[PDB]
Amino acid sequence: MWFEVLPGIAVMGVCLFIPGMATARIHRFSNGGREKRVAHYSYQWYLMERDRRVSGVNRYYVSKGLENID
Amino acid sequence: MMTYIVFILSIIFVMGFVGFSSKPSPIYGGLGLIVSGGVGCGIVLNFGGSFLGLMVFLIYLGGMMVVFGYTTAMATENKVVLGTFITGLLMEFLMVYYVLKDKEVEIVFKFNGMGDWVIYDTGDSGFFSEEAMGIAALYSYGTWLVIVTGWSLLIGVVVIMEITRGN
Amino acid sequence: SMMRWNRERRRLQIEDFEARIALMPLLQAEKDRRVLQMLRENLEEEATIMKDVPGWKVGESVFHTTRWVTPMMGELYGLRTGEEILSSTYGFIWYT
Amino acid sequence: MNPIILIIILMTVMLGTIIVMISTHWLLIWIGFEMNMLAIIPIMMKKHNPRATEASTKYFLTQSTASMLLMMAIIINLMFSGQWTVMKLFNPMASMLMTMALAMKLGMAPFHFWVPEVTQGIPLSSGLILLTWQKLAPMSVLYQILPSINLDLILTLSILSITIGGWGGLNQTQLRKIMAYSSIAHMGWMTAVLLYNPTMTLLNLIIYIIMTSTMFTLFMANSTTTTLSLSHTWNKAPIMTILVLITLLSMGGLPPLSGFMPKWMIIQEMTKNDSIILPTLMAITALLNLYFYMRLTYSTALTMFPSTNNMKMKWQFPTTKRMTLLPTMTVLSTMLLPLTPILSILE
Amino acid sequence: VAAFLKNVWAKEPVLVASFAIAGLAVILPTLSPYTKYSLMINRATPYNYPVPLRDDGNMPDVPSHPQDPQGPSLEWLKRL
Amino acid sequence: MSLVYMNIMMAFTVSLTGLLMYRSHLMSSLLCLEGMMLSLFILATLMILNSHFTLASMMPIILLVFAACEAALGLSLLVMVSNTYGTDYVQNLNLLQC
Amino acid sequence: PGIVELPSLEDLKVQEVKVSSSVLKAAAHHYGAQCDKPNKEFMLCRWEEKDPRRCLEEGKLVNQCALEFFRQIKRHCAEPFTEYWTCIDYSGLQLFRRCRKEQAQFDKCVLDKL
Amino acid sequence: MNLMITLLTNFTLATLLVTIAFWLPQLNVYSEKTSPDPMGSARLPFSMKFFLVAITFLLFDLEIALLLPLPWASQTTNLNTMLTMALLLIFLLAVSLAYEWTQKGLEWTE
Amino acid sequence: PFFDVQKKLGVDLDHWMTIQSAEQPHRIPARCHAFEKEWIECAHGIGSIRAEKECKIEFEDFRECLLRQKTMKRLNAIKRQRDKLIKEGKYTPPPHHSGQEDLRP
Amino acid sequence: MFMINVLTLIIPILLAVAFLTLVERKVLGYMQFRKGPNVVGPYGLLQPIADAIKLFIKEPLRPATSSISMFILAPILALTLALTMWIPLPMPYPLINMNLGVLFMLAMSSLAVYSILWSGWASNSKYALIGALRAVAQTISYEVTLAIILLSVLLMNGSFTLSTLIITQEQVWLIFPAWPLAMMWFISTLAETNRAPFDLTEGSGFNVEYAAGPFALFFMAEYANIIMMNIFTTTLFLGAFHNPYMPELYTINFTIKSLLLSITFLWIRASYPRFRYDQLMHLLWKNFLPLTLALCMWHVSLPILLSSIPPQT
Numbered sequence A: 001m002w003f004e005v006l007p008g009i010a011v012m013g014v015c016l017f018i019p020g021m022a023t024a025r026i027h028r029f030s031n032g033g034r035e036k037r038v039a040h041y042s043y044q045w046y047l048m049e050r051d052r053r054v055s056g057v058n059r060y061y062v063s064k065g066l067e068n069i070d
Numbered sequence B: 001m002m003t004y005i006v007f008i009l010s011i012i013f014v015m016g017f018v019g020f021s022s023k024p025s026p027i028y029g030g031l032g033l034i035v036s037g038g039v040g041c042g043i044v045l046n047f048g049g050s051f052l053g054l055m056v057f058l059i060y061l062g063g064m065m066v067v068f069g070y071t072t073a074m075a076t077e078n079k080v081v082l083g084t085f086i087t088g089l090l091m092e093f094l095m096v097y098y099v100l101k102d103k104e105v106e107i108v109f110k111f112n113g114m115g116d117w118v119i120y121d122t123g124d125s126g127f128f129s130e131e132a133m134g135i136a137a138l139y140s141y142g143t144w145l146v147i148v149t150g151w152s153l154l155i156g157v158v159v160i161m162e163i164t165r166g167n
Numbered sequence C: 001s002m003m004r005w006n007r008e009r010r011r012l013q014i015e016d017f018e019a020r021i022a023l024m025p026l027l028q029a030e031k032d033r034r035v036l037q038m039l040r041e042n043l044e045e046e047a048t049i050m051k052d053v054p055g056w057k058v059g060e061s062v063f064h065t066t067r068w069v070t071p072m073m074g075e076l077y078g079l080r081t082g083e084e085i086l087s088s089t090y091g092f093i094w095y096t
Numbered sequence D: 001m002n003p004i005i006l007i008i009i010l011m012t013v014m015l016g017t018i019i020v021m022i023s024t025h026w027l028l029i030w031i032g033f034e035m036n037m038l039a040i041i042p043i044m045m046k047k048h049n050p051r052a053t054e055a056s057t058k059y060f061l062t063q064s065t066a067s068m069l070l071m072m073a074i075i076i077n078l079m080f081s082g083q084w085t086v087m088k089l090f091n092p093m094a095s096m097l098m099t100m101a102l103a104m105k106l107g108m109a110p111f112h113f114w115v116p117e118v119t120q121g122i123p124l125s126s127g128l129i130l131l132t133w134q135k136l137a138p139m140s141v142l143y144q145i146l147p148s149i150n151l152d153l154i155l156t157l158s159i160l161s162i163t164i165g166g167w168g169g170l171n172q173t174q175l176r177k178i179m180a181y182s183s184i185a186h187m188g189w190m191t192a193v194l195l196y197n198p199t200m201t202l203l204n205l206i207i208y209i210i211m212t213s214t215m216f217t218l219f220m221a222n223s224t225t226t227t228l229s230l231s232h233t234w235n236k237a238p239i240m241t242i243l244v245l246i247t248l249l250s251m252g253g254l255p256p257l258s259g260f261m262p263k264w265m266i267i268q269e270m271t272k273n274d275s276i277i278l279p280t281l282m283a284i285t286a287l288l289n290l291y292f293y294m295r296l297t298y299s300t301a302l303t304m305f306p307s308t309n310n311m312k313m314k315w316q317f318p319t320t321k322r323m324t325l326l327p328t329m330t331v332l333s334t335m336l337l338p339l340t341p342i343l344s345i346l347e
Numbered sequence E: 001v002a003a004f005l006k007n008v009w010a011k012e013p014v015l016v017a018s019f020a021i022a023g024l025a026v027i028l029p030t031l032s033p034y035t036k037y038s039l040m041i042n043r044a045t046p047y048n049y050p051v052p053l054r055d056d057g058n059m060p061d062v063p064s065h066p067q068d069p070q071g072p073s074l075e076w077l078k079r080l
Numbered sequence F: 001m002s003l004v005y006m007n008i009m010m011a012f013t014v015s016l017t018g019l020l021m022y023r024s025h026l027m028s029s030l031l032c033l034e035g036m037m038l039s040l041f042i043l044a045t046l047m048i049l050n051s052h053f054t055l056a057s058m059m060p061i062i063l064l065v066f067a068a069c070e071a072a073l074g075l076s077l078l079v080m081v082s083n084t085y086g087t088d089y090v091q092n093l094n095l096l097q098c
Numbered sequence G: 001p002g003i004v005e006l007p008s009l010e011d012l013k014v015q016e017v018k019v020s021s022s023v024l025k026a027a028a029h030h031y032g033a034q035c036d037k038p039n040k041e042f043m044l045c046r047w048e049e050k051d052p053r054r055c056l057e058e059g060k061l062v063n064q065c066a067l068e069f070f071r072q073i074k075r076h077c078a079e080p081f082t083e084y085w086t087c088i089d090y091s092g093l094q095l096f097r098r099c100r101k102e103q104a105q106f107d108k109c110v111l112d113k114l
Numbered sequence H: 001m002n003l004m005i006t007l008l009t010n011f012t013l014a015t016l017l018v019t020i021a022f023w024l025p026q027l028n029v030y031s032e033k034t035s036p037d038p039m040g041s042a043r044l045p046f047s048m049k050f051f052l053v054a055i056t057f058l059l060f061d062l063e064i065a066l067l068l069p070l071p072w073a074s075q076t077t078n079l080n081t082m083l084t085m086a087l088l089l090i091f092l093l094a095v096s097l098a099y100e101w102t103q104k105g106l107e108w109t110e
Numbered sequence I: 001p002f003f004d005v006q007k008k009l010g011v012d013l014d015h016w017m018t019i020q021s022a023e024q025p026h027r028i029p030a031r032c033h034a035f036e037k038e039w040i041e042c043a044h045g046i047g048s049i050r051a052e053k054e055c056k057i058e059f060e061d062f063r064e065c066l067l068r069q070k071t072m073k074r075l076n077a078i079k080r081q082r083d084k085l086i087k088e089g090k091y092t093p094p095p096h097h098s099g100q101e102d103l104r105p
Numbered sequence J: 001m002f003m004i005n006v007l008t009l010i011i012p013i014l015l016a017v018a019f020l021t022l023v024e025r026k027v028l029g030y031m032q033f034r035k036g037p038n039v040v041g042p043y044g045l046l047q048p049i050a051d052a053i054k055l056f057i058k059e060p061l062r063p064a065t066s067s068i069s070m071f072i073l074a075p076i077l078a079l080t081l082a083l084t085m086w087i088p089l090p091m092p093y094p095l096i097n098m099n100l101g102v103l104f105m106l107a108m109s110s111l112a113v114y115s116i117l118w119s120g121w122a123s124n125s126k127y128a129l130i131g132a133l134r135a136v137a138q139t140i141s142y143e144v145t146l147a148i149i150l151l152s153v154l155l156m157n158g159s160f161t162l163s164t165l166i167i168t169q170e171q172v173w174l175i176f177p178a179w180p181l182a183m184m185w186f187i188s189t190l191a192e193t194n195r196a197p198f199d200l201t202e203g204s205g206f207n208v209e210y211a212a213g214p215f216a217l218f219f220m221a222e223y224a225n226i227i228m229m230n231i232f233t234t235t236l237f238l239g240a241f242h243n244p245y246m247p248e249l250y251t252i253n254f255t256i257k258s259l260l261l262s263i264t265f266l267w268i269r270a271s272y273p274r275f276r277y278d279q280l281m282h283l284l285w286k287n288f289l290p291l292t293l294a295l296c297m298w299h300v301s302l303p304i305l306l307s308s309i310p311p312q313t
């Protein structure tokens, strides 16, 4: 009956679900387990570049906390 | 190369203008002007003017060149084209090789030969685009500007309804 | 619902802007030492480069005034490598 | 055209010229020119024949190219000064481009080639608007930017305008093309005294607007387009031939008519500045304009060309037209030379 | 005014809804008690750095610390 | 000055010389005119963004609006000529010589 | 024209604040409350002199008082501060609103101990 | 730079698909044929109606272009001026549409 | 015909977009705010004829702020001398001009 | 790693387009009291594969085009502006996170009528050109109310950022304060993509003069436009719950809402007859546009009278 349309809709749902899950896991993997730093405004970019300079490894996401100061 | 990306898009912009300015037809003229509007929008986008580049795409190529192609496609249906094309391209590439070898050129004013990244600022603007605030100041400051522009558009509607009436 | 939530969002925006404001003097001191660092380095390398050239004044300010002029992108990143120049001159524009 | 819409459109034309006059920003100058052109295009197409569409096409292309050159001159001023004040330009090249754009907007030579066609195509009242009102805006901008104008450029444009507008109108039989070459010559006369004393520029502007206003009001009052149609006025209305006699003799600058006043003050100001040769060649050129005004007066007033039988019927209908201010504009345009030191009110 | 309105709401209801929404949009911010608070919120959002003042000696209404009592605060914002 | 400014000015002069040498079509004249407008937009935008002069960021939008209304007026003129003759040829427009 | 006077690198050596942006952001309100006076003296000197060369001693006082601030945190409440800035650092926009219970823990521990 | 890589990838995939779609069924051989429309051979009639709706779109698109920075303009200090000019622009768009209505502009594209 | 209506009626129609030193949105400075402020405050009220020859130094500084011609000339001279001494082999770049050195803040 | 992200964007787009044809034929089957395709594969799941291989080995229609260049460039521009509309979509984290993603999508969708116009001019049939001009005038007509409805909705957002339009709708769906804008948006996007009950390219079509291959490329560009406008409508009016630690919650939630909305397109195309061309021109210019201007004045004036002006950042 009506539930015969549901395998096609399920395959279409998986083929819409691959991009979102894919880009979320790619952003979380390529930034050390965290979301990609959203830098829309230049203050956020200044802080991002400051992180990239203070990390020592030329990666903005490698955070340095209180262990890096004395 | 990549430091010269605004320069590369500017060269492609001039090549597009020599491409349609030799005028094969209004159809291919519109085609070349569309490609030139896209690459000039890219020139705008590489300085941080994202809203003005999207005004190019949304208004220029979105409304006006669509209406140009719309009128061209229903109201129309060489040697000199190719010759003027290669003439303008030889002028442009002579200028390109001059500024490649000399790092300085004077056509009318004097011009630099460096990459055009050298004309920027090194600071940050906080929590706003500067150009976004400047266009947001159209309503809070530009009272006279909005009045004369809106009145010109209202008279534009009136004028087009007068002269396309035929009677 | 949109009234209450946009008022709460304005209060959170004021919190973020005041966290920014409390951080701005430290970032301003870091920025000042950054630009003076890079100008002093470019001045010393201009001193060790411009020794053959006659009539050259190392550190010749092209302005007639003695006011501190904000340093240009090319006045800081002039001698530096192209990857640094691109990451500083189109970094914010090209960032995703 | 709807009369309410006609009033709104004419007030939009006047608003565009007022915005050119009052504003201190270059973008608002350009906006005033755009509003002026955009609202004046249906004034030319009030009758909707192919000649008006051709005339508005030529007018639109010339004023559009001039407005693009004006915005390019403004933009290069923003390069070399970083600011938008309407004052002298801080670049020679922006000065040359803006002088060429204002020359294309005034119809001065060698950008003059649109003036007789657009004057011929459109009606007489829209031609009056074109030849009087549309000169007010670029002459105001030239009045404001004169500390940057290249002297040799504006004098070359001026003498070439006077020579072409003089050596053109001798052949013509159309009245509107005669007024158009008169326009080209008088704009040469206005821009030649511009860098020496601009009060004489404004004086020539007023006296030219009064004389062209008188002439097109007479041309509307008799509905004449050619020389012969003007010359058949003597049996329809004898006084109109006398009025076009005295006003055409004024527009070439006969003493002691008031059209002699502007160019006499111009030669009076150009010889103060040790230019004896240039107003001499200009006054030598103006005698040709005076000659074909003499030819037109021999056609119209001092002789009587033979009429038809149908004129006897038009004897029995006096003119039901709005001859607005025609005796005032005739009295001002001929009998004003004893009031020559009235020019100081323009200082 | 009650007959013609029912007439036009019978024949052209879309334009009646358009003019009614537009009339509310024009007249209602001059009647609403919150239009004061929109100004008070927008000028209390600190986009720029609060550049401090040189203490000449007589400014009793300018604080010396953020947690000082004097100075304009935002209790109306946290309460509303 | 900057070299991209020279290229945008050369783009403007190229579309100028394309506008000043008519081939056949009036639409080609209007397209050269709007290429002139486009190069004005790019040049003004680069100067206004480069100097950080914030209040002129609303200027290129006003340039775009006014000259696009100018182009709409030009298209209506071209359509009236296309109703008169059939094409948009510039050699049809030789009535006002006499 | 003139020879522009740039201060020496030996006059620019100072111990930097080598922490991240989420670390500075998670301690920003307590920083602006506690490190008020050298920060405001430096920004007052920075607007009035209009010259970063005339502000380097005040910049070093800012850079020293900020390090004293992070020392006075690190002696007492390193664990709740770490728990707070890790949660701030997870987010993309670094929302304060995603991290309210760690904020309550950190502000409670600071208000008790300091 | 991620944007231009993505645009290059999408344009390249589309160009590749178009090349494959025009040149894969040319590998078939089948045959050749003669191959000799409601209107037969008449010239295209120019519709004034289509041009009028295109210019009406262009003018209302320009008025939209003036209306676009309102989400950024609500953040101003000067709210009375901002709100007055915003309602002024939308009312001028409504006057443009009303003049387009009442003086018989929207005819046979109603 | 510069009919100064804005000074007569007192309205401020377009003096606000005119110069870079004017009241900008949220106090955003232009990149040449100081130079244009000094040139405007030099040339105020002295007229254009005395301004083109007495305030020439401020306007030279300001035009060099706008177009940066002398600075690009100086950078081209220094960078061409550096490229020449690299190509001759007579010079080496320092660690802080090659990227192996951990940038400061 | 980023090229992996672009490929995992634009391969499942094309697969979702491929199975949207199966979902269309099945859902329009059971709404017409019949079955859709169920013989080609198990439950019909091999129908679009068989149909695509049918199209790509069909003999080319081989026309003498007026322009070869526009005839090649129309499917290229159609597919490019079908695939580059997905890149700013916050689902939950966008591929190209940009500040002006809304205005980007409006601009790139307003550019896509050149494919219709070029594909219509490149045919030699004057009647095909006339049908293409009618489709172009339809789409550029409804672009107006797309832009104004979009502006009036984003007055509640605070900026053009698409990712902020999730954070805007944590408390309530945005269809509750803006359901008239939502329903005029819905019918205006139904009329954008030449979708029934507006599809006047069935009656000549603009792309009927192409071969079967390039017609299939137009077809998959149009269905990518359909799925994209439904996902943009879902993001913009039904923005779902977003836990930043588990993004798959938002991904499943907008996926279910977007599939219900695309099936609502399929359920509207099988329920109403076609508008005549003057009827949908009337529907826009005299019915949807006055209400859109009125609601634009209302959504300008409403945050000022509620003191609810949203944050820019």
Ligand SMILES: CCCCCCCCCCCCCCCCCC(=O)OC[C@H](COP(=O)([O-])OCC[N+](C)(C)C)OC(=O)CCCCCCCCCCCCCCCCC
Residues within 6 Å of the ligand: E011, E012, E013, E014, E015, E016, E017, E020, E021, J180, J182, J183, J184, J186, J187, J233, J237, J268, J272, J283, J287, J288, J291
């Ligand atoms: C995004 C989520 C999903 C969205 C909704 C999905 C379901 C809805 C869609 C169902 C299928 C529709 C298929 C297409 C239909 C096309 C035909 C059609 O409907 O034409 C539109 C019809 C056209 O009318 P018509 O065609 O019936 O009649 C001809 C028109 N007249 C009568 C004028 C001559 O209606 C509209 O244009 C209305 C549009 C929506 C209006 C919403 C207004 C809301 C109320 C505002 C306030 C009211 C009170 C006033 C103020 C009070 C103050 C106190």
Ligand SMILES: CCCCCCCCCCCCCCCCCC(=O)OC[C@H](COP(=O)(O)OCCN)OC(=O)CCCCCCCCCCCCCCCCC
Residues within 6 Å of the ligand: A011, A014, A015, J041, J042, J045, J046
């Ligand atoms: C996000 C999800 C996306 C999913 C995309 C794909 C959706 C559909 C997936 C497949 C569904 C099942 C297909 C079953 C096909 C028929 C199987 C079969 O048994 O065919 C029999 C046929 C003839 O066999 P024969 O031995 O000759 O018969 C005599 C037997 N007594 O044998 C044959 O015809 C030869 C064998 C044909 C096998 C074809 C199998 C399907 C291939 C589809 C391509 C995509 C595969 C999946 C990709 C995504 C997952 C990785």
Ligand SMILES: CCCCCCCCCCCCCCCCCC(=O)OC[C@H](COP(=O)(O)OCCN)OC(=O)CCCCCCCCCCCCCCCCC
Residues within 6 Å of the ligand: D125, D126, D128, D129, D132, D133, D202, D205, D206, D209, D210, D213, D217, D220, D322, D323, D324, D325, D329, D346, I001
């Ligand atoms: C330093 C200088 C500063 C500035 C100083 C001031 C400069 C003022 C310049 C004024 C120039 C006026 C030019 C015309 C203005 C518009 C009026 C006009 O042309 O109206 C046309 C109108 C058409 O009516 P319509 O119904 O179309 O009939 C036509 C046939 N059916 O009606 C008609 O056709 C009616 C016919 C008669 C109209 C006569 C109008 C004369 C007005 C001008 C008077 C002279 C100039 C002013 C005095 C000198 C000022 C310098």
Ligand SMILES: CCCCCCCCCCCCCCCCCC(=O)OC[C@H](COP(=O)(O)OCCN)OC(=O)CCCCCCCCCCCCCCCCC
Residues within 6 Å of the ligand: E008, E012, E015, E016, E018, E019, E020, E022, E023, E026, H091, H094, H097, H098, H101, H102, J290, J291, J293, J294
């Ligand atoms: C001041 C507030 C703001 C006002 C400006 C902003 C408006 C926003 C909406 C924009 C509307 C744009 C178009 C408006 C054009 C109006 C003129 C018009 O269309 O008249 C013709 C029409 C008859 O239509 P017809 O041609 O018969 O239709 C064919 C299909 N049946 O005639 C009609 O349908 C009659 C329409 C007019 C009468 C409607 C009365 C509504 C009253 C509601 C309560 C009072 C609200 C206050 C404002 C009233 C303004 C008049």
Ligand SMILES: CCCCCCCCCCCCCCCCCC(=O)OC[C@H](COP(=O)(O)OCCN)OC(=O)CCCCCCCCCCCCCCCCC
Residues within 6 Å of the ligand: A039, A040, A041, B034, B035, B036, B037, B038, B039, B041, B042, B043, B045, B046, B050, B053, B054, C092, C093, C094, C095, C096, H001, H003, H004, H007, H011, J073, J076, J077, J080, J081, J084, J097, J098, J099, J100, J101, J104
């Ligand atoms: C027939 C011809 C071929 C037709 C098919 C192919 C062309 C048409 C389809 C592709 C259209 C491409 C449009 C690309 C530009 C869109 C606007 C844009 O760049 O927006 C994204 C973003 C703005 O957002 P924002 O967040 O403010 O900026 C980052 C700062 N945080 O900005 C950025 O992030 C800046 C990114 C760097 C600059 C990107 C520039 C792109 C290249 C130039 C245009 C190339 C296409 C030219 C032809 C167009 C069509 C004629």
